[PDB]
Amino acid sequence: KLDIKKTFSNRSDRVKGIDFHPTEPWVLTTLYSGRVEIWNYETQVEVRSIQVTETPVRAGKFIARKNWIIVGSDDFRIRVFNYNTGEKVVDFEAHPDYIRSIAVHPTKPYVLSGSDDLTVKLWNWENNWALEQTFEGHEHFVMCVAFNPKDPSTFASGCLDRTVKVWSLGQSTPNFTLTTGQERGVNYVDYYPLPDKPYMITASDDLTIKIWDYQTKSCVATLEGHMSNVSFAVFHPTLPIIISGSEDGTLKIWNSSTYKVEKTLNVGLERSWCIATHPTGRKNYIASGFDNGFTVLSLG
Amino acid sequence: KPHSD
């Protein structure tokens, strides 16, 4: 049963990236102001915060097995900090343009970064953060990168060039390119995490969300309802729902069977930019970042 | 630049 409860919301400068820690009740936010914050959303106290740079930090993830966060900013740099001490672990120029998205491999010491420089790059932290591969082919800003959780030797990139490309580590060309028909670009791409469907989902400035079968490359459904740019759309890892957020200021919860909207929320923080779901579905927690702060919600 | 915000 739905029953959405606000577990914790706080105001801040624009939140561009957001992520849950898998074992600690923490959420990381990365802000347009160059600040990043880690909050305990149950006690409502900051565990750690850092003024990383003066430029926007659009991407941030926990690397829990190393006790790190990894962040990427408009100053072209990837930085890694230990969240127990605040100490900076590494600081390098990753791309000659904005970093939009960072993905962390579940079992290997690999991170992917997607950039306005039209590429995705693969970095190996057990090889001194060496650049091990650059994936070329996209023709506009790479807005989102995500590993296939069912096979993380592959990953998807979503791009303003209106395509999603799916790649294999160690190979220079896409396994396939998905022509989305979302003519104003792809802002976000996500995988359905369960084994029963080979699904991906894309979000666009053209106000649509689309579901794809990655075996046949077919569009399964198109979700309409948002009134401004759709910033993200994701499958919930345990509940039969899709969650999206938009510059129209709303989050929408969609039935993942019928593809109909179940609930629209305006949490009152203006434009929505980013989303996270708790890795193990603890308390069905989700979190989203907005122009004016973030909110952590329990869905039921 | 697109998506500057």
User: Could you say which DSSP state residue B3 is in?
Assistant: T
**Do B3 and A14 lie within an 8 Å CB cutoff?**
no
Q: Would you mind telling me the total number of residues written for chain B in this entry?
A: 5
Q: Least CB-CB distance to B2: which of A32, A141, A271? A: A141
The breaks in chain A (C to N more than 2.5 Å) occur after none
Q: With 0-12 CB in 10 A as exposed, 13-18 as middle and 19+ as buried, what is A232?
A: buried
Scanning B1-5 for CB atoms below 8 A from A yields 1-3, 5
CB atoms within 10 A of CB A171: 12
**What is the DSSP annotation of A23-55?**
SSSEEEEEETTSEEEEEETTTTEEEEEEE--SS
What's the CATH number for A7-300? 2.130.10.10
Tell me the C-alpha distance between A247 and A220, whole Å: 25
Q: Are the CB atoms for A27 and A62 separated by under 8 Å?
A: no
Look up tokens 């060039």; give the residue: A161
Return the ∠ at Cα A276 (arms to A271 and A282), rounded to 5°.
Answer: 135
**What is the DSSP annotation of chain A?**
----EEEEEEE-S-EEEEEE-SSSSEEEEEETTSEEEEEETTTTEEEEEEE--SS-EEEEEEEGGGTEEEEEETTSEEEEEETTT--EEEEEE--SS-EEEEEE-SSSSEEEEEETTS-EEEEEGGGTTEEEEEE---SS-EEEEEE-TT-TTEEEEEETTSEEEEEETT-SS-SEEEE---TT---EEEE--STT--EEEEE-TTSEEEEEETTTTEEEEEEE--SS-EEEEEE-SSSSEEEEEETTSEEEEEETTT--EEEEEE-SSSSEEEEEE-TT-GGGEEEEEETTEEEEEE--
AA letter at A170: G
CB atoms within 10 A of CB A157: 28
**Do A116 and B5 lie within an 8 Å CB cutoff?**
no
Closest CA to A27 of A242, A243, A298, A277: A277
**Do A14 and B5 lie within an 8 Å CB cutoff?**
yes
**Do A160 and B2 lie within an 8 Å CB cutoff?**
yes
Q: Which long-range CB contacts under 8 A does A66-71 form with residues at least 24 apart?
A: A66/A125, A69/A28, A69/A36, A69/A38, A70/A102, A70/A104, A70/A111, A71/A17, A71/A30, A71/A36, A71/A102
> A160 to chain B: which residues are within 8 Å by CB?
2-3
Give the nearest chain B residue to A14 (CA atoms).
B5
**What is the DSSP annotation of A161-187?**
TSEEEEEETT-SS-SEEEE---TT---
* DSSP SS3 for B1: coil
> B1 to chain A: which residues are within 8 Å by CB?
98, 116
**Closest-CA distance of chain A to residue B2, Å:** 9
Give the nearest chain B residue to A184 (CA atoms).
B2
> B2 to chain A: which residues are within 8 Å by CB?
141, 160, 185
Tokens representing A248 are 């129209």
Tokens representing A275 are 């989303």
Closest CA to A226 of A243, A208, A210: A208
Q: Are the CB atoms for A74 and A115 separated by under 8 Å?
A: no
Resolution, angstroms, 1 dp:
1.7
Q: Are the CB atoms for A7 and A41 separated by under 8 Å?
A: yes
Q: Would you mind telling me the total number of residues written for chain A in this entry?
A: 300
B2's CB contacts (< 8 A; 6+ apart) are: A141, A160, A185
User: Could you say which DSSP state residue B5 is in?
Assistant: -
Give the nearest chain A residue to B5 (CA atoms).
A32
Output phi, psi for A185, to 5 deg: 110, 170
User: Could you say which DSSP state residue B2 is in?
Assistant: T
Tokens representing A162 are 């209106």
